[PDB]
């Protein structure tokens, strides 16, 4: 199976049993298996919400609407506090039933539809596509907020800015330029350090001395 960098050897806990397993856990947060199940459900939930959020920010910035980091300060039909109140009140039951569905099944569900599948298109292929698009959408939303924090523009005005001058309107010519440049450089040279770790200790997995890892075993 493909990996997060070419020729990567996966950790002993990321043995490809789950989907999206590109062997990515350099911090070994998924050494515990129940933690890994909870983290998979959390990955897919963060990703579902970021999918909806990315498409929503896109639909909002596509038309003449307030910017997504200023849309909360607009005036609405309800007061702020009652909005938050009803939100908490309904999400109480919603997330309670979702947590119950996780405890029962191990996957998500709406309220009682353990598998929210009106149109029965559930598959492992569709699961992998949901996971992949959800990771992509988490990255996309992070980028929305980040290049709306450097600039005062949302997704597509910044995209048009990059398309206007690709060499001069990019992340390395903005205020966060240098740190992203050095970060990208380190991330490019990192896998060879990791591959040295794998090479000079052939077959021997190493423990990185982390608190969540229980490295004394």
């Amino acid at each position: 199976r493909p990996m997060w960098y070419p020729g990567a050897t996966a950790p002993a806990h990321l043995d490809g049993s789950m989907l999206g397993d590109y062997g990515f856990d350099p911090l070994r947060l998924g050494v515990n298996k129940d933690n890994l199940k909870w983290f998979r459900e959390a990955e897919l939930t963060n990703g579902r919400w970021a999918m909806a959020a990315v498409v929503g920010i896109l639909f909002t910035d596509a038309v003449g609407l307030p910017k997504f980091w200023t849309a909360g300060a607009e005036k609405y039909a309800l007061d702020n506090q009652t909005l938050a109140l009803i939100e908490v009140a309904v999400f109480a039951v919603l997330e309670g039933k979702r947590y119950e569905i996780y405890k029962k099944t191990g996957e998500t569900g709406f309220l009682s539809f353990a598998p929210f599948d009106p149109m029965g298109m559930k598959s492992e292929e569709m699961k992998l596509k949901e996971l992949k698009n959800g990771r992509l959408a988490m990255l996309a939303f992070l980028g929305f907020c980040s290049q709306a924090a450097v600039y005062g523009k949302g997704p597509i005005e910044t995209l048009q800015l990059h398309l206007a001058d690709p060499g001069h309107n990019n992340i390395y010519t903005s205020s966060v330029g240098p740190e992203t440049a050095v970060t990208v450089a380190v991330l490019c040279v990192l896998p060879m350090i990791i591959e040295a770790t794998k090479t000079l200790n052939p077959g021997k997995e190493s423990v990185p001395y982390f608190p969540w890892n229980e490295p004394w075993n």
């Binding site: 515990n32 933690n35 947590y99 969540w212």
Partner: protein, 100 residues
């Protein structure tokens, strides 16, 4: 046996011999209201494990202390956040040589 004739050592009763006693512990199950017990058993379900409670502690404490540094020490109006509000002890480097 144990409790009579000053026979303070019995192999069949090693708890009374060694002193493994519950001086005050009672084993009664009828303490709390079952609605309240259900509430407070359900309210602790997500943290009833060691690693999960340590995760909540880490999250909440990192967040509390980070937002303390960002807004809370200012909301508390700590002097380190307000600054000196004066010239300070700049020009008085010493009693002899008043350095900056």
């Amino acid at each position: 046996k144990y409790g009579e004739n000053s026979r303070y050592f019995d192999l069949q009763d090693m708890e009374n011999t060694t002193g493994s006693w519950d001086m005050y512990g009672v084993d009664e199950k009828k303490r709390y209201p079952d609605n309240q017990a259900k509430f407070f058993t359900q309210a602790t379900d997500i943290i009833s494990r060691r690693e999960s409670l340590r995760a909540l502690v880490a999250l909440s404490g990192i967040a509390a202390i980070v937002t303390y540094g960002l807004k809370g020490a200012k909301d508390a109006d700590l002097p380190i956040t307000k600054g000196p509000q004066t010239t300070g002890e700049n020009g008085k480097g010493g009693s002899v040589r008043s350095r900056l």
